[PDB]
Amino acid sequence: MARWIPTKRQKYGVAIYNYNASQDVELSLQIGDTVHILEMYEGWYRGYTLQNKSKKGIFPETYIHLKEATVEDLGQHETVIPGELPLVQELTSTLREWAVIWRKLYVNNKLTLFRQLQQMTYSLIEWRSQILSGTLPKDELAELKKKVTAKIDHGNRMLGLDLVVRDDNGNILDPDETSTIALFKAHEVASKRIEEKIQEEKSILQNLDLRGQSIFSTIHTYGLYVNFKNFVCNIGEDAELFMALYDPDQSTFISENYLIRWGSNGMPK
């Protein structure tokens, strides 16, 4: 089907839904497929599926879904927030590979770790969704990105899958033959994350005191939540509440009080 004008802009699109089988290379193809729309036409554009960059189909612009995307994270801005398009695109890729592998994790009747894979999968889809809600400020995205790398490497470990690199902004950005030594540094620190992650998983896997120790040991700025509801007693006069802190051991007090005007019948003044 003639009249083909190419542009790299169009090489990456998807479909709205099932197709029709009217013609030969026009069969009722699947809903969401990153297809190779290499060239453009009046009524129907080319298509070379994700499953075969050579299988042919001349699909209509109408049935091209909301994707004129490219490898350029800049052009159509359906790559809404570039730079994080990397993280999310390999996020999708790894989720696809995880689904594939655990699909044959049935005879590996590891329903335990299988179900942790599903838990991580739901966690991952919702995390990515929040990222797509990229209205958030920068620190939240940073921390999310860090734990995303954590979970990805986690899964690749127990799944027997390869290590990723580049701690920041991409997990991959190393391959540029930047520095073999820096490459080793990243690999080693990440691997340390790996064994420390396995042992902290065994830690957080039976009891969860150590997590309290750690989280209260990073920063030590604490306050006391007086989660008061009601005073169960009755004095008859303006009984005044004075909480305070004292060490049974140091024989000395710690903080200062707060006056609370509680009323004369177990009610608040």
Partner: protein, 550 residues
Amino acid sequence: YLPSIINDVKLVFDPVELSVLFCKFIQSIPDNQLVRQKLNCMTKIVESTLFRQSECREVLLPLLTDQLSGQLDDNSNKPDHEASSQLLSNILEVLDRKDVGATAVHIQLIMERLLRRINRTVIGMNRQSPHIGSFVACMIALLQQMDDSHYSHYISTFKTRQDIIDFLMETFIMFKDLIGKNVYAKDWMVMNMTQNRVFLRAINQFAEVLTRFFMDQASFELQLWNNYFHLAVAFLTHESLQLETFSQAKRNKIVKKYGDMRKEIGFRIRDMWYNLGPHKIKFIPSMVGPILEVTLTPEVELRKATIPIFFDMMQCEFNFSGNGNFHMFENELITKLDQEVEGGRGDEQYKVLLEKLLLEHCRKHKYLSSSGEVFALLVSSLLENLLDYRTIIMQDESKENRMSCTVNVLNFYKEKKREDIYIRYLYKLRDLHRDCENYTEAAYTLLLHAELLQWSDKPCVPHLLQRDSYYVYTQQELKEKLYQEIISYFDKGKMWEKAIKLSKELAETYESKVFDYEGLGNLLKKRASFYENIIKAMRPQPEYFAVGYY
């Protein structure tokens, strides 16, 4: 804390002066003192004001090179290893950053005083306990950061020819140690393939230096290709199409970011070998074995490029088959094909492309091509037999079919009188019958194996031995051992006439050949026991059903 000032010293001072001042200071350390601490000092230095490279490089890197080279072999350096690795790490890491200025020559010097040095160091670190990976890193970074210009410049241009050949000994053996038993946990696919990349490039450069200084022009001392080709093959023998298959894009990944290394590796191999020229005859019986694992890689391109190499070596052997034949190639050729294709690595399209190329070769050359044609037919037969064999082997588990196919190929080999793999499969059969718990037929196989052997007191051949147990073994020792388990089978087979016959000849061989009268008595009294069993025991008559196949 002394270096902790240098960055701001520079801002109000002659950086060169500061550098040489630190040099004069540190060089004065009594070497019997505070080694790792002074190394840490050198690190804290090399981090800073070495960004101001263009003036202090030429005066520190000499000195720092000297200290590391002194650190090289002091025979007590095991904790020094980690610190020296940090120093190498950091010097190279700063030298590779792009905002430093012309550093090629300074590398060149670090090269010139540490290549074989750290190479020997890791050649010491071969124990898998320490931080090997650090030094492996420093190695690969040294040799990739540098340039071919440097090798050709002086690394190729070291001292006397014998010495440089010893250096090459060192490098290639240690590489071949690297390709096997990777020092990285194989999960570091990024890092692992990077290492493959850099090693490949280094091996290329060494290919040029070998070509340059070791052809027939250097007719002298020309073995190293043993080490070279072995290195090339062992390198070539991982990262195979299954590994890249594990995702569709996994293939595409290693292709895009690296290409497929195997192609160029094999190309270097083939044209290296072509340039070897009039001396390939020194290689056939050795190097046929290696070149199949490249021949058998599941790809098409280099396989097509490679196949002619067998023809080239066999026709070179025809230059030496002016006297005689090329069988002293094809025997071991066939043997190797047998081992590998039974290993589970062949392809039918492999033999198809084989056929095409071999037929090209035949339909080029004269009468020896007719010979090679009939031998190509032999090879074909061989293949499709192994192919059907294998495809049946591991699927049905129908021991009947397994026995049928293996004896089919045993019969074929018998026809082609290849006694060795013959024996191999005969023992496969005894194990197969054992797992079938069939004893008469297992004994029968054992016999037809044994009847090859004769009663000569000369241990004529060790080739007939299975590689399980051997000492001097005059053939009669093996024959009588065979008979021991054979008569054991015939016993447990509850069939006796053949057993008592074998007892007859075993007894006569004892009595008139070895005079081991205890064994005489043992076997003959057992023969008597078998006689009484013949009479006393019952023999059920198995019935014979005719099974047509249509």
